[PDB]
Design a protein around this motif. Sequence first.
Motif, PDB file in Angstrom:
ATOM      1  N   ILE B 148      -4.428  65.211  46.994  1.00 56.75           N
ATOM      2  CA  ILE B 148      -5.077  64.137  46.192  1.00 56.75           C
ATOM      3  C   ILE B 148      -6.321  64.585  45.363  1.00 56.75           C
ATOM      4  O   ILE B 148      -7.257  63.804  45.130  1.00 56.75           O
ATOM      5  N   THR B 149      -6.302  65.846  44.920  1.00 54.66           N
ATOM      6  CA  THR B 149      -7.284  66.404  43.966  1.00 54.66           C
ATOM      7  C   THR B 149      -6.676  67.659  43.307  1.00 54.66           C
ATOM      8  O   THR B 149      -5.570  68.071  43.674  1.00 54.66           O
ATOM      9  N   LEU B 150      -7.392  68.253  42.346  1.00 54.08           N
ATOM     10  CA  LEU B 150      -6.955  69.466  41.614  1.00 54.08           C
ATOM     11  C   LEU B 150      -5.661  69.272  40.810  1.00 54.08           C
ATOM     12  O   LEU B 150      -4.774  70.140  40.824  1.00 54.08           O
ATOM     13  N   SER B 151      -5.566  68.138  40.110  1.00 56.20           N
ATOM     14  CA  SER B 151      -4.355  67.773  39.358  1.00 56.20           C
ATOM     15  C   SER B 151      -4.626  66.835  38.169  1.00 56.20           C
ATOM     16  O   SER B 151      -5.790  66.601  37.788  1.00 56.20           O
ATOM     17  N   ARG B 152      -3.541  66.297  37.598  1.00 58.96           N
ATOM     18  CA  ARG B 152      -3.612  65.501  36.361  1.00 58.96           C
ATOM     19  C   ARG B 152      -2.889  64.132  36.423  1.00 58.96           C
ATOM     20  O   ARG B 152      -3.483  63.104  36.072  1.00 58.96           O
ATOM     21  N   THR B 153      -1.633  64.141  36.893  1.00 57.85           N
ATOM     22  CA  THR B 153      -0.694  62.990  36.885  1.00 57.85           C
ATOM     23  C   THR B 153      -1.205  61.701  37.569  1.00 57.85           C
ATOM     24  O   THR B 153      -1.886  61.763  38.598  1.00 57.85           O
ATOM     25  N   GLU B 154      -0.873  60.541  36.988  1.00 57.75           N
ATOM     26  CA  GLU B 154      -1.157  59.234  37.616  1.00 57.75           C
ATOM     27  C   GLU B 154       0.070  58.308  37.681  1.00 57.75           C
ATOM     28  O   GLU B 154       0.462  57.870  38.766  1.00 57.75           O
ATOM     29  N   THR B 155       0.664  58.017  36.523  1.00 58.61           N
ATOM     30  CA  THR B 155       1.843  57.154  36.444  1.00 58.61           C
ATOM     31  C   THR B 155       3.115  58.026  36.473  1.00 58.61           C
ATOM     32  O   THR B 155       3.131  59.130  35.908  1.00 58.61           O
ATOM     33  N   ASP B 156       4.161  57.524  37.138  1.00 55.77           N
ATOM     34  CA  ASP B 156       5.335  58.334  37.535  1.00 55.77           C
ATOM     35  C   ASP B 156       6.279  58.754  36.394  1.00 55.77           C
ATOM     36  O   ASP B 156       6.036  58.442  35.221  1.00 55.77           O
ATOM     37  N   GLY B 157       7.347  59.475  36.758  1.00 55.42           N
ATOM     38  CA  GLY B 157       8.381  59.899  35.817  1.00 55.42           C
ATOM     39  C   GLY B 157       8.518  61.409  35.732  1.00 55.42           C
ATOM     40  O   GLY B 157       7.864  62.042  34.901  1.00 55.42           O
ATOM     41  N   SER B 158       9.374  61.981  36.583  1.00 55.81           N
ATOM     42  CA  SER B 158       9.605  63.439  36.617  1.00 55.81           C
ATOM     43  C   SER B 158      11.087  63.882  36.518  1.00 55.81           C
ATOM     44  O   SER B 158      11.547  64.684  37.355  1.00 55.81           O
ATOM     45  N   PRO B 159      11.833  63.388  35.494  1.00 60.00           N
ATOM     46  CA  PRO B 159      13.248  63.801  35.346  1.00 60.00           C
ATOM     47  C   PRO B 159      13.426  65.302  35.015  1.00 60.00           C
ATOM     48  O   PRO B 159      12.488  66.093  35.205  1.00 60.00           O
ATOM     49  N   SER B 160      14.619  65.678  34.538  1.00 62.66           N
ATOM     50  CA  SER B 160      14.975  67.083  34.193  1.00 62.66           C
ATOM     51  C   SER B 160      14.613  68.117  35.278  1.00 62.66           C
ATOM     52  O   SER B 160      14.254  69.267  34.987  1.00 62.66           O
ATOM     53  N   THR B 161      14.738  67.686  36.531  1.00 59.47           N
ATOM     54  CA  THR B 161      14.398  68.497  37.708  1.00 59.47           C
ATOM     55  C   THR B 161      15.414  69.618  37.981  1.00 59.47           C
ATOM     56  O   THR B 161      15.132  70.521  38.783  1.00 59.47           O
ATOM     57  N   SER B 162      16.588  69.557  37.334  1.00 57.71           N
ATOM     58  CA  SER B 162      17.666  70.518  37.609  1.00 57.71           C
ATOM     59  C   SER B 162      18.506  70.858  36.394  1.00 57.71           C
ATOM     60  O   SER B 162      18.327  70.257  35.353  1.00 57.71           O
ATOM     61  N   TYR B 163      19.422  71.813  36.552  1.00 57.64           N
ATOM     62  CA  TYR B 163      20.254  72.345  35.462  1.00 57.64           C
ATOM     63  C   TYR B 163      21.532  71.544  35.174  1.00 57.64           C
ATOM     64  O   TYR B 163      21.770  70.499  35.782  1.00 57.64           O
ATOM     65  N   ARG B 164      22.347  72.058  34.250  1.00 59.00           N
ATOM     66  CA  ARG B 164      23.615  71.430  33.836  1.00 59.00           C
ATOM     67  C   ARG B 164      24.854  72.151  34.415  1.00 59.00           C
ATOM     68  O   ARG B 164      25.311  73.181  33.907  1.00 59.00           O
ATOM     69  N   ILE B 165      25.393  71.571  35.480  1.00 62.10           N
ATOM     70  CA  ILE B 165      26.404  72.195  36.334  1.00 62.10           C
ATOM     71  C   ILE B 165      27.797  72.205  35.703  1.00 62.10           C
ATOM     72  O   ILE B 165      28.296  71.150  35.305  1.00 62.10           O
ATOM     73  N   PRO B 166      28.453  73.381  35.654  1.00 59.62           N
ATOM     74  CA  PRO B 166      29.774  73.430  35.033  1.00 59.62           C
ATOM     75  C   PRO B 166      30.821  72.706  35.861  1.00 59.62           C
ATOM     76  O   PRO B 166      31.176  73.151  36.947  1.00 59.62           O
ATOM     77  N   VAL B 167      31.302  71.579  35.363  1.00 57.93           N
ATOM     78  CA  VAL B 167      32.362  70.865  36.064  1.00 57.93           C
ATOM     79  C   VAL B 167      33.683  71.585  35.777  1.00 57.93           C
ATOM     80  O   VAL B 167      34.426  71.242  34.844  1.00 57.93           O
ATOM     81  N   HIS B 168      33.959  72.603  36.576  1.00 56.09           N
ATOM     82  CA  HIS B 168      34.965  73.565  36.207  1.00 56.09           C
ATOM     83  C   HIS B 168      35.422  74.347  37.409  1.00 56.09           C
ATOM     84  O   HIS B 168      34.610  74.834  38.173  1.00 56.09           O
ATOM     85  N   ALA B 169      36.726  74.491  37.572  1.00 52.26           N
ATOM     86  CA  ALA B 169      37.234  75.117  38.760  1.00 52.26           C
ATOM     87  C   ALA B 169      36.750  76.536  38.810  1.00 52.26           C
ATOM     88  O   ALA B 169      36.719  77.230  37.790  1.00 52.26           O
ATOM     89  N   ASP B 170      36.300  76.923  40.000  1.00 54.34           N
ATOM     90  CA  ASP B 170      36.077  78.321  40.396  1.00 54.34           C
ATOM     91  C   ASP B 170      34.742  78.940  40.012  1.00 54.34           C
ATOM     92  O   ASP B 170      34.587  80.169  40.074  1.00 54.34           O
ATOM     93  N   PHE B 171      33.778  78.102  39.636  1.00 54.99           N
ATOM     94  CA  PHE B 171      32.409  78.567  39.394  1.00 54.99           C
ATOM     95  C   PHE B 171      31.690  78.328  40.679  1.00 54.99           C
ATOM     96  O   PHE B 171      32.090  77.421  41.417  1.00 54.99           O
ATOM     97  N   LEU B 172      30.653  79.116  40.965  1.00 55.58           N
ATOM     98  CA  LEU B 172      29.727  78.809  42.083  1.00 55.58           C
ATOM     99  C   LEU B 172      28.302  79.244  41.814  1.00 55.58           C
ATOM    100  O   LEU B 172      28.038  80.404  41.496  1.00 55.58           O
ATOM    101  N   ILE B 173      27.373  78.316  41.978  1.00 61.97           N
ATOM    102  CA  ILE B 173      25.986  78.617  41.651  1.00 61.97           C
ATOM    103  C   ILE B 173      25.026  78.548  42.839  1.00 61.97           C
ATOM    104  O   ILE B 173      24.906  77.498  43.481  1.00 61.97           O
TER     105      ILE B 173
END
Lengths: 235, 260
Positions: B148-173
């Motif tokens: 609760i110190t050493l920061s900036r944020t007050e009001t929420d909203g943190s999308p784009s937390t992850s990547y774009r997963i290939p919906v495709h047979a035989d890939f693994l990440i």
Amino acid sequence: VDRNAPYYNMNHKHRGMAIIFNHEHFDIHSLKSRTGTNVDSDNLSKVLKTLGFKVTVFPNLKSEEINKFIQQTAEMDHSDADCLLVAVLTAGELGMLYAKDTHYKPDNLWYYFTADKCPTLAGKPKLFFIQACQGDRLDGGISYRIPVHADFLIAFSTVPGYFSWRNTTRGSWFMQALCEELRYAGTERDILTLLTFVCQKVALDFESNAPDSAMMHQQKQVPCITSMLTRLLVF
Amino acid sequence: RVARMPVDRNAPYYNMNHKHRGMAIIFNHEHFDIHSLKSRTGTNVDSDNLSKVLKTLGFKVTVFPNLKSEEINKFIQQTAEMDHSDADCLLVAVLTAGELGMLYAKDTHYKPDNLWYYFTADKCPTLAGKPKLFFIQACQGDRLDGGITLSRTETDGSPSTSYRIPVHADFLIAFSTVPGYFSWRNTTRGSWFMQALCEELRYAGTERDILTLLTFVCQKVALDFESNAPDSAMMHQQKQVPCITSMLTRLLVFGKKQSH
């Protein structure tokens, strides 16, 4: 035994709650109705009972209400429970799910289950099966927030293949594959092997899938298994 | 009881003995021609240890130090345009800094899906059916609340937390971001993730499926997490772990055939 044990401790008084959010109809102009979402749902409800889960089906809830139940689930003594299952059947993309009223971000489903918020489910698997159909390989015109937190599992779908009875439709490849697998298997295999095989089943019905005669793109469309599990999960 | 050979479209395992295993190509970044961005010291440990084991698993490993983004894309593509018909699979390792959905090259950042794009069936019919694995280590690790110190944020909203997963047979990440490492004095070296990855691949990579394997990698990561910033007592529950995304359609056991 160990903190470094190969398996999840699957035998406390009770298995755990599976709670199913099921959407067929939408108070959103022009979003087509989801027919035979009830086949999938009632098929799933069936099997999860025989596995020992105390299942609850909630049909067609307004977005705000799902958060109320999910949350009011997240605030219980899961101490006698082996795990947790949450299933959602509905419309939308990889990163916006629908409720009867409006869309929401999938992360709100697992949000309230983290160890700091659900210390009673700490180390217990927390499973989320989402089927949210929409599936055209197209992002040209010239996903979700993965929780990095041990012991989550997310199987997400969007493959729009189904079985259909006469002209009406009823029960999707994904959901069917997953019951058959959980049924005729769920006590001798780990969950990730199982889910592998579900993929295969979906993957293989793709070939009853729209394109042909050499249409741009190729390799089958499957579910996405995202797994933060730290142990083998055998029911 | 046993291990067998051929018979199914619906066969349980990947055909893991062709003439070759495949290609592993590691992209390793330690320094950054970007102001602000700290040196990823000891990324060379991980790199050289990964590379060691993938040779014993029988890959034709190639290692690309501190490349520019354009150059990574040149080799990625140049890889996708090869005759993999002799290969069992395809591995890409990327050890850099950055987030779950942005990676850094020497010069600039880029999106992880540029890594597997060129490799899908239509674009690599010779890998179609075959497993394409991408392990990615992209160190940075903060899930908020606690101080609760050493920061900036007050009001929420943190999308784009992850990547774009290939919906495709035989890939693994398999994607880390857990910023815990082993260190030798002041200096760091070797991430919990990679040492875990290698130990599992080495002393077991040959009788267990890739997924069980990576499961045990998570366990190992989760367990060191407890040499982790707060959590200042007791047993606790678990942790912050790698992310294993799988669109695999068969169990994948690192098989063998000496004289093929």
